[PDB]
């Protein structure tokens, strides 16, 4: 029978991590980050790495018998930012175009009802 996986995508403003797991999500099947593929620290969160590393994970996932996958995109959330990093949709195109069937795409960014105080002091990050 057709097998379904779950693609946890975690795209910050500094990196992007693609982690493909089973339907129960308890088994790490493919786990490729932006740092694996580019040697410059500043290019990790780019959609280019989110393309390339995502395809590198996708082919291995196809090799291990999984053809279909759902997507779960997670911005850092919590007390951190809420907007997904730029490369999330790029990686989504990666999985779609690398042969994987795409099922349900839902967001799983952890939103706090009332959480901790954020970082940087009262007057914000005075860049």
């Amino acid at each position: 029978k057709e097998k379904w996986g779950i693609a946890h995508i975690y795209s910050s403003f500094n990196n992007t991590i693609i982690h493909i797991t089973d339907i129960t999500g308890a088994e790490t099947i493919s786990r490729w980050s932006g740092g694996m593929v580019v040697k410059a620290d500043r290019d990790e969160p780019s959609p280019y790495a989110a393309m390339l590393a995502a395809r590198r994970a996708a082919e291995e996932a196809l090799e291990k018998g999984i053809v279909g996958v759902h997507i779960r995109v997670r911005a850092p959330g919590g007390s951190k930012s809420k907007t997904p990093g730029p490369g999330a949709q790029a990686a989504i195109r990666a999985l779609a175009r690398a042969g994987l069937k795409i099922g349900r795409v839902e967001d799983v960014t952890p939103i706090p009802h009332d959480g901790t105080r954020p970082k940087g002091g009262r007057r914000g990050r005075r860049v």
Partner: protein
């Protein structure tokens, strides 16, 4: 390589949902399949696309060779759907209750109501009171499984809207999320 050491087990639903095939999972040992949770939409159970928003969490408890059976640990509506329903110039009423079933199952149930316009608070309290009464009554009348089924059906929600129209017309009454606390 450890992947060659794995094996794939099939999983089913609980009986009251028909025990339909849901998926397969790789695992080294059958004991490692115990205490595993799977999230599956209601369209993937009944095939109805109107209830894709609904999601059901099944907790695995039985491993019979390659067969794996599961119980109903929780349910939750889609956060996208919840976000869509909520809108400005409207009042969101959240009612959280702890309930025992007729067979003794323990549950925490959270129900949402949305009205047409901004509304006075006491009217919202009356709405909460009405639906408190009705779900308490159904908890004492129905057993655990049929209660789960009807809550998923939305018949309770529609009846609740009918009863709460006597206080204010509701745009939509619904059940958002349910968590099973304990079992008898």
């Amino acid at each position: 390589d450890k992947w060659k050491l794995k094996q794939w087990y099939i999983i089913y639903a609980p009986d009251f949902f028909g025990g339909v095939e849901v998926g397969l999972t790789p695992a080294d040992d059958p004991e490692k399949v115990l205490n595993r949770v799977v999230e599956v939409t209601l369209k993937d159970v009944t095939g109805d696309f109107t209830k894709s928003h609904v999601k059901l969490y099944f907790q695995v408890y039985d491993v019979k060779g390659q067969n794996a059976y599961t119980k109903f640990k929780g349910m939750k509506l889609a956060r996208s759907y919840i976000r869509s329903l909520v809108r400005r110039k409207t009042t969101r009423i959240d009612g959280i209750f702890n309930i025992t079933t007729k067979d003794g199952y323990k549950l925490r149930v959270m129900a949402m109501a949305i009205a047409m316009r901004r509304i006075q608070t006491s009217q919202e309290r009356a709405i909460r009171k009405i639906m408190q009464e009705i779900i308490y009554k159904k908890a004492e009348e129905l057993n655990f499984k049929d209660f789960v089924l009807e809550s998923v059906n939305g018949k309770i929600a529609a009846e609740i809207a009918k009863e709460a129209k006597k206080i204010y017309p509701l745009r939509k009454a619904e059940i958002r999320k349910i968590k099973v606390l304990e079992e008898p």
